[model samples]
Target: HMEEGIVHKLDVFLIDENVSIKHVNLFDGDSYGCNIHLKTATCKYITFILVLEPDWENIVEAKPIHMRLNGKKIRVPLVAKTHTSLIYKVVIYVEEDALARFYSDVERSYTDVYPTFLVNTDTRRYYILDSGRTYTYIDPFISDGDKRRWL
Candidate 1:
Protein backbone atom coordinates (compact mmCIF):
# COMPACT_ATOMS: atom_id res chain seq x y z
CA HIS A 1 0.00 0.00 0.00
CA MET A 2 1.16 3.50 -0.74
CA GLU A 3 1.09 6.45 1.62
CA GLU A 4 -1.88 8.65 0.76
CA GLY A 5 0.07 11.87 1.04
CA ILE A 6 2.91 10.58 -1.07
CA VAL A 7 0.55 9.30 -3.75
CA HIS A 8 -1.21 12.65 -3.91
CA LYS A 9 2.10 14.44 -4.20
CA LEU A 10 3.17 12.08 -7.00
CA ASP A 11 -0.03 12.74 -8.92
CA VAL A 12 0.63 16.47 -8.77
CA PHE A 13 4.24 15.96 -9.79
CA LEU A 14 3.24 13.89 -12.84
CA ILE A 15 0.93 16.63 -14.03
CA ASP A 16 3.54 19.33 -13.57
CA GLU A 17 6.18 17.27 -15.34
CA ASN A 18 3.94 16.42 -18.29
CA VAL A 19 3.09 20.10 -18.73
CA SER A 20 6.78 20.74 -19.25
CA ILE A 21 7.69 17.77 -21.54
CA LYS A 22 5.33 18.43 -24.46
CA HIS A 23 6.69 15.82 -26.90
CA VAL A 24 7.07 12.46 -25.16
CA ASN A 25 4.93 9.30 -25.25
CA LEU A 26 3.70 7.29 -22.29
CA PHE A 27 3.19 3.54 -22.64
CA ASP A 28 1.15 1.14 -20.49
CA GLY A 29 2.79 -0.70 -17.56
CA ASP A 30 2.10 -4.25 -18.79
CA SER A 31 4.31 -3.64 -21.82
CA TYR A 32 7.41 -3.75 -19.66
CA GLY A 33 6.15 -6.66 -17.52
CA CYS A 34 5.84 -4.48 -14.42
CA ASN A 35 3.20 -3.33 -11.95
CA ILE A 36 2.25 -0.05 -10.30
CA HIS A 37 1.34 0.37 -6.66
CA LEU A 38 -2.36 1.23 -6.49
CA LYS A 39 -2.67 1.25 -2.74
CA THR A 40 -5.29 3.26 -0.90
CA ALA A 41 -6.46 3.86 2.64
CA THR A 42 -8.67 6.16 4.64
CA CYS A 43 -7.55 8.45 7.43
CA LYS A 44 -8.71 5.96 10.06
CA TYR A 45 -7.42 2.85 8.31
CA ILE A 46 -3.92 3.97 7.65
CA THR A 47 -2.03 0.72 7.35
CA PHE A 48 -2.58 -2.97 6.67
CA ILE A 49 -0.61 -6.04 5.70
CA LEU A 50 -1.20 -8.27 2.73
CA VAL A 51 0.23 -11.74 2.70
CA LEU A 52 0.12 -13.92 -0.40
CA GLU A 53 0.95 -17.19 1.26
CA PRO A 54 0.72 -20.43 -0.62
CA ASP A 55 -1.40 -23.38 0.50
CA TRP A 56 1.63 -25.65 0.86
CA GLU A 57 2.06 -25.90 4.62
CA ASN A 58 5.72 -26.98 4.66
CA ILE A 59 6.94 -24.31 2.27
CA VAL A 60 7.98 -20.95 3.66
CA GLU A 61 7.03 -18.02 1.49
CA ALA A 62 8.52 -14.68 2.34
CA LYS A 63 9.77 -11.80 0.28
CA PRO A 64 9.30 -8.04 0.34
CA ILE A 65 7.43 -6.90 -2.76
CA HIS A 66 8.42 -3.33 -3.09
CA MET A 67 5.82 -1.14 -4.72
CA ARG A 68 6.98 0.07 -8.10
CA LEU A 69 5.89 1.94 -11.21
CA ASN A 70 5.57 -0.82 -13.79
CA GLY A 71 6.01 0.20 -17.42
CA LYS A 72 2.92 -1.20 -19.21
CA LYS A 73 0.49 -3.77 -17.80
CA ILE A 74 -0.54 -1.65 -14.81
CA ARG A 75 -3.92 -1.71 -13.19
CA VAL A 76 -5.66 -0.36 -10.12
CA PRO A 77 -5.85 -3.04 -7.49
CA LEU A 78 -9.26 -3.94 -6.08
CA VAL A 79 -8.11 -3.12 -2.55
CA ALA A 80 -8.88 0.53 -3.16
CA LYS A 81 -12.65 0.37 -2.65
CA THR A 82 -13.45 4.03 -2.49
CA HIS A 83 -14.04 6.12 -5.60
CA THR A 84 -10.76 7.82 -6.40
CA SER A 85 -9.20 9.97 -9.07
CA LEU A 86 -5.55 9.93 -10.03
CA ILE A 87 -3.19 10.79 -12.85
CA TYR A 88 0.34 9.61 -13.68
CA LYS A 89 2.68 10.63 -16.48
CA VAL A 90 6.22 9.56 -17.24
CA VAL A 91 8.93 10.15 -19.86
CA ILE A 92 11.49 7.70 -21.27
CA TYR A 93 14.34 7.86 -23.74
CA VAL A 94 13.34 6.53 -27.18
CA GLU A 95 15.88 4.33 -28.93
CA GLU A 96 16.28 2.34 -32.16
CA ASP A 97 15.47 -1.31 -32.77
CA ALA A 98 18.38 -3.69 -32.15
CA LEU A 99 17.39 -6.58 -34.47
CA ALA A 100 17.47 -4.61 -37.69
CA ARG A 101 20.55 -5.30 -39.84
CA PHE A 102 20.74 -1.70 -40.98
CA TYR A 103 20.84 -0.26 -37.48
CA SER A 104 22.85 2.74 -38.57
CA ASP A 105 20.43 3.50 -41.41
CA VAL A 106 17.93 5.05 -39.06
CA GLU A 107 20.44 5.80 -36.34
CA ARG A 108 20.43 9.47 -35.41
CA SER A 109 17.64 9.94 -37.96
CA TYR A 110 15.45 11.02 -35.08
CA THR A 111 16.29 14.27 -33.43
CA ASP A 112 17.46 14.29 -29.83
CA VAL A 113 14.06 15.50 -28.78
CA TYR A 114 12.35 14.78 -25.50
CA PRO A 115 8.79 13.53 -25.85
CA THR A 116 6.29 14.43 -23.08
CA PHE A 117 3.36 12.13 -22.40
CA LEU A 118 0.23 12.22 -20.24
CA VAL A 119 -2.00 9.59 -18.70
CA ASN A 120 -5.29 10.31 -16.99
CA THR A 121 -4.87 8.15 -13.91
CA ASP A 122 -8.63 7.83 -13.64
CA THR A 123 -9.53 7.38 -17.29
CA ARG A 124 -6.42 5.41 -18.29
CA ARG A 125 -6.27 7.17 -21.66
CA TYR A 126 -2.73 8.03 -22.74
CA TYR A 127 -2.86 11.39 -24.46
CA ILE A 128 -0.61 13.15 -26.97
CA LEU A 129 -0.98 15.73 -29.66
CA ASP A 130 -2.66 14.50 -32.86
CA SER A 131 -0.14 16.32 -34.96
CA GLY A 132 1.68 13.53 -36.82
CA ARG A 133 5.05 15.19 -36.92
CA THR A 134 5.86 15.82 -33.28
CA TYR A 135 5.09 12.62 -31.37
CA THR A 136 4.26 9.03 -32.33
CA TYR A 137 2.54 6.33 -30.27
CA ILE A 138 4.52 3.16 -29.72
CA ASP A 139 2.90 0.24 -27.88
CA PRO A 140 5.68 -1.30 -25.83
CA PHE A 141 3.34 -3.87 -24.27
CA ILE A 142 2.78 -5.64 -27.58
CA SER A 143 6.46 -6.02 -28.37
CA ASP A 144 9.89 -5.98 -26.75
CA GLY A 145 11.13 -3.19 -29.01
CA ASP A 146 10.53 0.47 -28.03
CA LYS A 147 11.36 2.36 -31.20
CA ARG A 148 9.07 4.79 -33.00
CA ARG A 149 8.87 4.24 -36.76
CA TRP A 150 7.67 6.72 -39.32
CA LEU A 151 3.92 6.48 -39.79
Candidate 2:
Protein backbone atom coordinates (compact mmCIF):
# COMPACT_ATOMS: atom_id res chain seq x y z
CA HIS A 1 0.00 0.00 0.00
CA MET A 2 1.30 3.45 -0.93
CA GLU A 3 0.83 6.57 1.10
CA GLU A 4 -1.37 9.32 -0.24
CA GLY A 5 0.20 12.14 -2.28
CA ILE A 6 3.51 10.38 -2.42
CA VAL A 7 5.17 10.40 -5.79
CA HIS A 8 6.06 6.85 -6.59
CA LYS A 9 9.38 6.19 -8.24
CA LEU A 10 9.16 5.00 -11.81
CA ASP A 11 11.02 1.88 -12.80
CA VAL A 12 11.93 0.65 -16.27
CA PHE A 13 13.03 -2.84 -17.14
CA LEU A 14 14.27 -4.01 -20.48
CA ILE A 15 12.26 -7.10 -21.26
CA ASP A 16 14.38 -7.72 -24.30
CA GLU A 17 18.13 -7.91 -24.35
CA ASN A 18 18.18 -5.52 -27.27
CA VAL A 19 15.99 -2.94 -25.62
CA SER A 20 17.39 0.08 -23.87
CA ILE A 21 16.25 3.42 -22.62
CA LYS A 22 17.38 6.51 -24.44
CA HIS A 23 15.57 8.97 -22.22
CA VAL A 24 12.66 8.80 -19.78
CA ASN A 25 10.75 11.14 -17.54
CA LEU A 26 10.15 10.55 -13.91
CA PHE A 27 6.64 9.08 -13.80
CA ASP A 28 4.40 10.57 -11.16
CA GLY A 29 0.95 11.99 -10.57
CA ASP A 30 1.92 14.84 -12.82
CA SER A 31 3.47 13.12 -15.83
CA TYR A 32 4.30 9.82 -17.54
CA GLY A 33 6.79 9.51 -20.36
CA CYS A 34 9.63 7.42 -21.73
CA ASN A 35 12.06 7.26 -24.62
CA ILE A 36 13.62 3.92 -25.39
CA HIS A 37 16.91 3.53 -27.24
CA LEU A 38 16.77 0.42 -29.37
CA LYS A 39 19.91 -1.54 -30.22
CA THR A 40 18.74 -4.64 -32.02
CA ALA A 41 17.91 -5.14 -35.66
CA THR A 42 14.44 -6.33 -34.77
CA CYS A 43 11.54 -4.93 -32.83
CA LYS A 44 11.90 -4.75 -29.05
CA TYR A 45 9.37 -4.47 -26.29
CA ILE A 46 9.78 -2.67 -22.96
CA THR A 47 7.67 -2.52 -19.84
CA PHE A 48 7.38 0.27 -17.36
CA ILE A 49 5.81 0.15 -13.91
CA LEU A 50 4.38 3.24 -12.30
CA VAL A 51 2.82 3.32 -8.86
CA LEU A 52 0.81 6.23 -7.58
CA GLU A 53 -0.54 7.32 -4.22
CA PRO A 54 -3.57 5.50 -2.91
CA ASP A 55 -7.03 6.78 -3.71
CA TRP A 56 -8.47 5.64 -0.43
CA GLU A 57 -11.71 7.53 -0.92
CA ASN A 58 -12.23 6.23 -4.45
CA ILE A 59 -11.95 9.73 -5.79
CA VAL A 60 -9.78 8.57 -8.67
CA GLU A 61 -11.47 6.28 -11.12
CA ALA A 62 -9.50 3.97 -13.31
CA LYS A 63 -9.32 5.01 -16.94
CA PRO A 64 -7.03 5.15 -19.91
CA ILE A 65 -4.53 7.96 -19.89
CA HIS A 66 -2.25 9.33 -22.58
CA MET A 67 1.45 9.78 -22.05
CA ARG A 68 3.87 11.75 -24.13
CA LEU A 69 7.09 10.35 -25.47
CA ASN A 70 9.40 12.38 -27.66
CA GLY A 71 6.65 14.94 -28.31
CA LYS A 72 4.14 12.27 -29.30
CA LYS A 73 1.03 11.16 -27.41
CA ILE A 74 0.79 7.55 -26.39
CA ARG A 75 -2.03 5.77 -24.61
CA VAL A 76 -1.24 4.00 -21.38
CA PRO A 77 -3.64 1.64 -19.67
CA LEU A 78 -4.64 1.72 -16.07
CA VAL A 79 -3.88 -1.90 -15.47
CA ALA A 80 -4.94 -2.13 -11.83
CA LYS A 81 -6.34 0.06 -9.08
CA THR A 82 -6.07 -1.61 -5.75
CA HIS A 83 -7.68 -0.46 -2.54
CA THR A 84 -4.38 1.01 -1.46
CA SER A 85 -2.87 2.28 -4.68
CA LEU A 86 -3.07 2.80 -8.45
CA ILE A 87 -0.91 0.55 -10.57
CA TYR A 88 -0.12 1.08 -14.23
CA LYS A 89 1.74 -1.14 -16.61
CA VAL A 90 2.80 0.58 -19.79
CA VAL A 91 4.21 -1.63 -22.48
CA ILE A 92 5.97 -0.16 -25.48
CA TYR A 93 7.70 -1.47 -28.54
CA VAL A 94 10.68 0.06 -30.32
CA GLU A 95 11.81 -0.75 -33.81
CA GLU A 96 15.42 -1.41 -34.59
CA ASP A 97 17.41 1.72 -33.89
CA ALA A 98 14.22 3.71 -33.31
CA LEU A 99 13.34 5.80 -30.32
CA ALA A 100 9.87 4.41 -29.57
CA ARG A 101 6.78 2.72 -30.92
CA PHE A 102 3.52 4.61 -30.43
CA TYR A 103 1.19 1.59 -30.27
CA SER A 104 -0.56 -0.40 -27.57
CA ASP A 105 -2.66 -3.52 -26.93
CA VAL A 106 -5.57 -2.01 -25.08
CA GLU A 107 -8.32 -3.78 -27.03
CA ARG A 108 -7.37 -7.35 -26.27
CA SER A 109 -9.45 -9.30 -23.78
CA TYR A 110 -8.76 -12.47 -21.84
CA THR A 111 -12.07 -12.88 -20.06
CA ASP A 112 -13.96 -16.15 -20.75
CA VAL A 113 -10.88 -17.28 -22.57
CA TYR A 114 -9.87 -20.34 -20.64
CA PRO A 115 -6.31 -21.57 -20.58
CA THR A 116 -5.03 -18.49 -22.30
CA PHE A 117 -1.32 -17.99 -22.07
CA LEU A 118 0.86 -14.96 -22.66
CA VAL A 119 3.86 -16.29 -24.47
CA ASN A 120 7.31 -14.84 -25.15
CA THR A 121 7.93 -15.77 -28.75
CA ASP A 122 11.63 -14.97 -28.56
CA THR A 123 12.23 -17.70 -26.03
CA ARG A 124 9.11 -19.81 -26.46
CA ARG A 125 8.31 -19.53 -22.77
CA TYR A 126 4.70 -19.46 -21.58
CA TYR A 127 3.58 -16.88 -19.08
CA ILE A 128 3.01 -18.47 -15.73
CA LEU A 129 -0.42 -18.32 -14.19
CA ASP A 130 -0.74 -18.23 -10.46
CA SER A 131 -3.98 -17.73 -8.56
CA GLY A 132 -5.81 -16.24 -11.53
CA ARG A 133 -3.01 -13.80 -12.17
CA THR A 134 -0.39 -13.97 -14.86
CA TYR A 135 3.30 -13.63 -14.05
CA THR A 136 6.39 -13.24 -16.18
CA TYR A 137 10.04 -12.52 -15.68
CA ILE A 138 11.01 -8.91 -16.08
CA ASP A 139 14.49 -9.27 -17.50
CA PRO A 140 14.93 -10.28 -21.14
CA PHE A 141 11.23 -10.69 -21.85
CA ILE A 142 9.43 -9.00 -24.70
CA SER A 143 6.39 -7.04 -23.62
CA ASP A 144 4.85 -7.27 -27.08
CA GLY A 145 5.72 -10.93 -27.26
CA ASP A 146 3.74 -11.35 -24.10
CA LYS A 147 0.66 -12.29 -26.08
CA ARG A 148 -2.30 -14.50 -25.37
CA ARG A 149 -1.80 -18.02 -26.63
CA TRP A 150 -4.64 -20.53 -26.73
CA LEU A 151 -4.04 -23.58 -24.68
Candidate 3:
Protein backbone atom coordinates (compact mmCIF):
# COMPACT_ATOMS: atom_id res chain seq x y z
CA HIS A 1 0.00 0.00 0.00
CA MET A 2 2.89 2.32 0.75
CA GLU A 3 4.36 1.88 -2.75
CA GLU A 4 1.12 2.68 -4.53
CA GLY A 5 2.24 6.23 -5.18
CA ILE A 6 5.72 5.26 -6.27
CA VAL A 7 4.75 2.45 -8.67
CA HIS A 8 2.68 4.39 -11.21
CA LYS A 9 4.56 7.60 -10.78
CA LEU A 10 6.70 8.53 -13.83
CA ASP A 11 5.78 12.11 -14.60
CA VAL A 12 8.11 13.12 -11.80
CA PHE A 13 11.01 11.50 -13.65
CA LEU A 14 12.84 12.29 -16.95
CA ILE A 15 14.03 10.38 -19.96
CA ASP A 16 16.83 10.78 -22.48
CA GLU A 17 15.61 12.49 -25.63
CA ASN A 18 18.75 11.72 -27.62
CA VAL A 19 18.81 7.97 -26.92
CA SER A 20 20.55 5.98 -29.68
CA ILE A 21 21.34 2.45 -30.81
CA LYS A 22 24.57 1.69 -32.62
CA HIS A 23 24.81 -1.36 -34.90
CA VAL A 24 28.25 -2.59 -33.89
CA ASN A 25 29.59 -6.14 -33.97
CA LEU A 26 32.26 -6.31 -31.29
CA PHE A 27 32.95 -9.84 -32.62
CA ASP A 28 34.04 -11.23 -29.29
CA GLY A 29 31.34 -13.33 -27.59
CA ASP A 30 29.24 -10.39 -26.43
CA SER A 31 26.00 -11.89 -27.79
CA TYR A 32 23.33 -9.93 -29.63
CA GLY A 33 24.54 -7.98 -32.71
CA CYS A 34 23.95 -4.36 -31.75
CA ASN A 35 24.65 -1.90 -28.97
CA ILE A 36 22.04 0.40 -27.48
CA HIS A 37 23.47 3.45 -25.84
CA LEU A 38 20.99 5.99 -24.56
CA LYS A 39 21.92 8.87 -22.33
CA THR A 40 19.21 10.94 -20.66
CA ALA A 41 20.18 14.41 -19.62
CA THR A 42 18.93 17.34 -17.66
CA CYS A 43 22.55 18.46 -18.08
CA LYS A 44 23.21 16.36 -14.99
CA TYR A 45 22.58 13.17 -16.98
CA ILE A 46 19.27 11.42 -16.27
CA THR A 47 20.24 7.96 -17.45
CA PHE A 48 18.70 4.49 -17.50
CA ILE A 49 20.15 1.09 -18.32
CA LEU A 50 18.30 -1.19 -20.80
CA VAL A 51 19.50 -4.60 -19.81
CA LEU A 52 18.54 -7.97 -21.23
CA GLU A 53 16.43 -10.20 -18.95
CA PRO A 54 19.01 -12.94 -19.25
CA ASP A 55 21.89 -11.04 -20.74
CA TRP A 56 24.64 -13.17 -22.19
CA GLU A 57 27.05 -11.22 -20.05
CA ASN A 58 27.31 -7.94 -18.05
CA ILE A 59 28.08 -5.71 -21.06
CA VAL A 60 31.36 -5.58 -23.01
CA GLU A 61 33.29 -3.50 -20.53
CA ALA A 62 31.92 -5.53 -17.63
CA LYS A 63 33.47 -8.60 -19.25
CA PRO A 64 36.69 -9.14 -21.17
CA ILE A 65 36.72 -8.75 -24.97
CA HIS A 66 37.80 -11.47 -27.38
CA MET A 67 38.67 -9.21 -30.36
CA ARG A 68 41.32 -7.09 -28.64
CA LEU A 69 44.03 -9.01 -30.47
CA ASN A 70 46.56 -7.09 -32.61
CA GLY A 71 44.91 -7.30 -36.04
CA LYS A 72 43.76 -10.85 -35.44
CA LYS A 73 40.65 -11.87 -37.43
CA ILE A 74 38.08 -13.71 -35.36
CA ARG A 75 34.28 -14.00 -34.93
CA VAL A 76 32.82 -12.71 -31.65
CA PRO A 77 29.29 -12.17 -30.39
CA LEU A 78 27.58 -8.82 -30.52
CA VAL A 79 26.63 -6.90 -27.35
CA ALA A 80 22.87 -7.18 -27.74
CA LYS A 81 20.01 -9.67 -27.65
CA THR A 82 18.09 -11.69 -30.24
CA HIS A 83 14.47 -12.85 -29.84
CA THR A 84 15.32 -16.41 -30.75
CA SER A 85 18.32 -16.43 -28.47
CA LEU A 86 17.04 -14.92 -25.18
CA ILE A 87 13.33 -14.34 -25.61
CA TYR A 88 12.06 -10.93 -26.82
CA LYS A 89 11.50 -9.35 -23.44
CA VAL A 90 13.23 -6.16 -22.33
CA VAL A 91 13.40 -4.45 -18.94
CA ILE A 92 14.29 -0.80 -18.43
CA TYR A 93 15.98 0.20 -15.20
CA VAL A 94 15.08 3.84 -14.68
CA GLU A 95 15.95 6.12 -11.84
CA GLU A 96 13.57 6.97 -9.01
CA ASP A 97 11.35 10.08 -8.94
CA ALA A 98 13.72 11.66 -6.47
CA LEU A 99 16.39 11.72 -9.18
CA ALA A 100 14.41 14.15 -11.31
CA ARG A 101 13.57 16.26 -8.32
CA PHE A 102 17.26 16.30 -7.45
CA TYR A 103 18.06 17.37 -11.00
CA SER A 104 15.49 20.15 -11.12
CA ASP A 105 12.51 21.37 -9.12
CA VAL A 106 10.96 23.37 -11.98
CA GLU A 107 10.73 20.39 -14.35
CA ARG A 108 7.89 17.94 -13.91
CA SER A 109 6.01 16.00 -16.59
CA TYR A 110 4.57 12.58 -17.33
CA THR A 111 6.54 9.96 -19.24
CA ASP A 112 5.09 6.52 -19.91
CA VAL A 113 7.22 3.66 -18.63
CA TYR A 114 6.30 0.09 -19.52
CA PRO A 115 7.38 -3.48 -18.83
CA THR A 116 9.64 -2.58 -15.96
CA PHE A 117 9.95 -6.21 -14.90
CA LEU A 118 6.93 -6.84 -12.69
CA VAL A 119 7.54 -10.54 -12.46
CA ASN A 120 10.23 -11.64 -10.07
CA THR A 121 10.06 -15.37 -9.41
CA ASP A 122 12.35 -15.06 -6.45
CA THR A 123 9.93 -12.82 -4.56
CA ARG A 124 7.13 -15.35 -4.39
CA ARG A 125 4.57 -15.72 -1.61
CA TYR A 126 2.26 -18.24 0.01
CA TYR A 127 -1.25 -17.96 -1.45
CA ILE A 128 -4.54 -19.79 -1.05
CA LEU A 129 -7.28 -21.33 -3.23
CA ASP A 130 -10.62 -19.67 -3.90
CA SER A 131 -12.66 -22.44 -2.27
CA GLY A 132 -11.31 -21.47 1.13
CA ARG A 133 -8.56 -24.06 0.77
CA THR A 134 -5.40 -23.13 2.66
CA TYR A 135 -1.66 -23.49 2.15
CA THR A 136 -1.86 -22.78 -1.63
CA TYR A 137 0.86 -20.67 -3.21
CA ILE A 138 1.21 -18.40 -6.22
CA ASP A 139 3.78 -16.80 -8.50
CA PRO A 140 2.78 -13.19 -8.83
CA PHE A 141 3.78 -10.45 -11.24
CA ILE A 142 3.44 -6.81 -10.45
CA SER A 143 3.78 -3.68 -12.58
CA ASP A 144 3.42 -0.10 -11.61
CA GLY A 145 0.48 -0.15 -9.16
CA ASP A 146 -1.03 -3.32 -10.58
CA LYS A 147 -0.42 -6.82 -9.23
CA ARG A 148 -1.69 -10.17 -10.52
CA ARG A 149 -0.95 -13.86 -10.86
CA TRP A 150 1.36 -14.95 -13.64
CA LEU A 151 -0.52 -18.18 -14.31
Candidate 4:
Protein backbone atom coordinates (compact mmCIF):
# COMPACT_ATOMS: atom_id res chain seq x y z
CA HIS A 1 0.00 0.00 0.00
CA MET A 2 1.11 3.60 -0.60
CA GLU A 3 2.09 5.83 2.27
CA GLU A 4 -0.45 8.09 3.95
CA GLY A 5 1.44 11.27 3.09
CA ILE A 6 1.95 12.58 -0.45
CA VAL A 7 5.29 12.23 -2.21
CA HIS A 8 6.86 15.67 -2.74
CA LYS A 9 9.58 16.62 -5.22
CA LEU A 10 11.64 19.71 -6.12
CA ASP A 11 12.03 20.72 -9.77
CA VAL A 12 14.54 23.12 -11.33
CA PHE A 13 14.68 24.53 -14.88
CA LEU A 14 17.48 26.42 -16.61
CA ILE A 15 15.66 29.11 -18.52
CA ASP A 16 17.21 31.27 -21.25
CA GLU A 17 19.10 34.24 -19.88
CA ASN A 18 17.66 36.52 -22.60
CA VAL A 19 14.20 36.15 -21.06
CA SER A 20 12.83 37.92 -18.02
CA ILE A 21 11.86 36.03 -14.89
CA LYS A 22 8.53 37.88 -14.66
CA HIS A 23 7.31 36.31 -17.92
CA VAL A 24 8.23 32.78 -16.74
CA ASN A 25 5.72 30.66 -14.83
CA LEU A 26 4.78 27.04 -14.20
CA PHE A 27 3.14 25.61 -17.33
CA ASP A 28 2.04 22.10 -16.25
CA GLY A 29 3.27 19.14 -14.20
CA ASP A 30 6.02 21.10 -12.46
CA SER A 31 7.36 22.89 -15.54
CA TYR A 32 7.88 26.51 -16.55
CA GLY A 33 7.11 28.37 -19.76
CA CYS A 34 7.44 31.91 -21.03
CA ASN A 35 4.47 34.02 -22.05
CA ILE A 36 3.95 36.76 -24.65
CA HIS A 37 4.68 39.56 -22.18
CA LEU A 38 8.41 38.88 -22.31
CA LYS A 39 10.61 42.01 -22.52
CA THR A 40 14.33 42.70 -22.86
CA ALA A 41 16.39 45.62 -21.56
CA THR A 42 19.90 47.01 -22.01
CA CYS A 43 22.49 45.18 -19.99
CA LYS A 44 25.93 43.60 -20.28
CA TYR A 45 24.65 40.26 -19.14
CA ILE A 46 21.78 39.06 -16.99
CA THR A 47 21.77 35.94 -14.80
CA PHE A 48 18.84 34.28 -13.04
CA ILE A 49 17.93 31.10 -11.19
CA LEU A 50 14.65 29.21 -10.68
CA VAL A 51 14.19 27.15 -7.56
CA LEU A 52 11.03 25.12 -6.85
CA GLU A 53 10.50 23.75 -3.39
CA PRO A 54 7.84 21.72 -1.62
CA ASP A 55 5.72 23.27 1.10
CA TRP A 56 6.34 20.58 3.69
CA GLU A 57 9.29 18.15 3.82
CA ASN A 58 12.51 18.10 1.78
CA ILE A 59 12.65 15.92 -1.34
CA VAL A 60 14.38 12.55 -0.87
CA GLU A 61 15.85 12.30 -4.38
CA ALA A 62 16.26 14.61 -7.38
CA LYS A 63 17.37 14.12 -11.01
CA PRO A 64 17.71 15.99 -14.27
CA ILE A 65 14.65 16.45 -16.43
CA HIS A 66 14.38 17.16 -20.17
CA MET A 67 12.46 20.30 -21.14
CA ARG A 68 11.80 22.15 -24.37
CA LEU A 69 12.89 25.72 -25.06
CA ASN A 70 12.15 27.29 -28.45
CA GLY A 71 11.42 23.78 -29.87
CA LYS A 72 14.67 22.08 -28.84
CA LYS A 73 14.93 19.81 -25.79
CA ILE A 74 17.29 20.95 -23.06
CA ARG A 75 18.35 19.06 -19.96
CA VAL A 76 17.44 20.92 -16.78
CA PRO A 77 19.27 19.62 -13.75
CA LEU A 78 17.45 19.06 -10.47
CA VAL A 79 19.23 19.51 -7.17
CA ALA A 80 17.89 18.10 -3.93
CA LYS A 81 17.88 20.02 -0.68
CA THR A 82 21.30 19.56 0.85
CA HIS A 83 21.24 21.93 3.81
CA THR A 84 18.27 24.19 3.05
CA SER A 85 17.18 24.41 -0.60
CA LEU A 86 18.20 23.97 -4.27
CA ILE A 87 18.62 26.39 -7.23
CA TYR A 88 19.49 26.61 -10.99
CA LYS A 89 21.42 29.26 -12.90
CA VAL A 90 21.25 30.73 -16.39
CA VAL A 91 23.38 33.45 -18.06
CA ILE A 92 22.51 35.87 -20.89
CA TYR A 93 25.12 37.91 -22.74
CA VAL A 94 24.51 41.24 -24.47
CA GLU A 95 26.24 42.51 -27.61
CA GLU A 96 29.28 44.61 -26.63
CA ASP A 97 29.14 46.99 -29.63
CA ALA A 98 25.47 47.82 -29.10
CA LEU A 99 26.03 48.66 -25.44
CA ALA A 100 29.04 50.87 -26.29
CA ARG A 101 27.06 52.81 -28.93
CA PHE A 102 24.19 53.40 -26.47
CA TYR A 103 26.62 54.83 -23.90
CA SER A 104 28.10 57.13 -26.57
CA ASP A 105 24.66 58.53 -27.42
CA VAL A 106 23.96 59.21 -23.76
CA GLU A 107 27.27 61.03 -23.40
CA ARG A 108 26.47 63.32 -26.34
CA SER A 109 23.13 64.33 -24.77
CA TYR A 110 24.75 65.20 -21.44
CA THR A 111 25.33 69.00 -21.50
CA ASP A 112 25.08 71.95 -19.12
CA VAL A 113 21.49 73.20 -19.47
CA TYR A 114 20.07 76.17 -17.57
CA PRO A 115 17.42 75.74 -14.84
CA THR A 116 13.71 75.53 -15.76
CA PHE A 117 12.72 78.81 -14.08
CA LEU A 118 14.32 82.15 -15.11
CA VAL A 119 13.85 85.37 -13.12
CA ASN A 120 13.36 88.47 -15.27
CA THR A 121 15.40 91.38 -13.92
CA ASP A 122 13.28 94.20 -15.47
CA THR A 123 9.79 92.79 -14.73
CA ARG A 124 10.84 90.80 -11.61
CA ARG A 125 8.60 87.87 -12.70
CA TYR A 126 9.46 84.20 -12.29
CA TYR A 127 8.70 82.29 -15.52
CA ILE A 128 8.91 78.50 -15.91
CA LEU A 129 10.15 77.63 -19.39
CA ASP A 130 11.07 74.44 -21.23
CA SER A 131 12.86 74.33 -24.58
CA GLY A 132 12.49 78.15 -24.86
CA ARG A 133 8.69 77.92 -24.35
CA THR A 134 7.10 79.50 -21.31
CA TYR A 135 4.78 77.18 -19.34
CA THR A 136 3.65 79.21 -16.32
CA TYR A 137 4.51 82.08 -13.93
CA ILE A 138 5.55 81.32 -10.36
CA ASP A 139 3.95 83.59 -7.77
CA PRO A 140 6.28 84.64 -4.94
CA PHE A 141 3.31 85.30 -2.62
CA ILE A 142 1.82 82.10 -1.26
CA SER A 143 -1.26 81.92 1.01
CA ASP A 144 -1.13 80.24 4.41
CA GLY A 145 -3.84 77.82 3.24
CA ASP A 146 -1.62 76.67 0.36
CA LYS A 147 1.23 75.98 2.80
CA ARG A 148 -1.12 73.99 5.02
CA ARG A 149 -2.32 72.00 1.99
CA TRP A 150 1.24 71.07 1.07
CA LEU A 151 2.00 70.04 4.67
Q: After superposition, how far is residue 59 of candidate 4 from its true place, in Å?
A: 5.7
Global Cα lDDT for candidate 4:
0.28
Q: Name the runs in model 2 displaced over 4 angstroms.
A: 1-7, 17-35, 54-65, 69-71, 100-151
Overall lDDT per candidate, in order of appearance: 0.21, 0.36, 0.21, 0.28
Cα shift from native, residue 122, model 1 (Å) = 1.2
Error of 2 at 99 (Å): 2.8
Listed in order, each prediction's TM-score against the native is 0.19, 0.38, 0.18, 0.29
Please list the Cα RMSD from the true structure of every candidate, rounded to 1 decimal place: 19.7, 13.6, 20.6, 23.1
- Show model 1 residue runs off by greater than 4 Å: 1-112, 130-135, 138-151
Best of the two (2, 3) by TM-score = 2
Which candidate tops lDDT? 2
Q: Any idea what lDDT model 3 has?
A: 0.21
Superposed by TM-score, candidate 3 places the C-alpha of residue 43 at a distance from the truth, in angstroms, of 3.9
Best by TM-score: 2
Per-residue lDDT tens digits for candidate 1, residues 1-68, read: 12111101011122311222221211211000111122222111111111121112322321222222
16 in model 4: Cα distance from truth in Å?
14
Model 4 C-alpha RMSD vs. true structure (Å) is 23.1
Residues 1-151 of candidate 3: C-alpha lDDT, one tens digit per residue: 1211111111111123222111111212222221122222222333322222223344423322222112332233334444412211122333321211111011121111111111111222211112011111222322332111111
**Candidate with the larger lDDT of 2 and 4:** 2
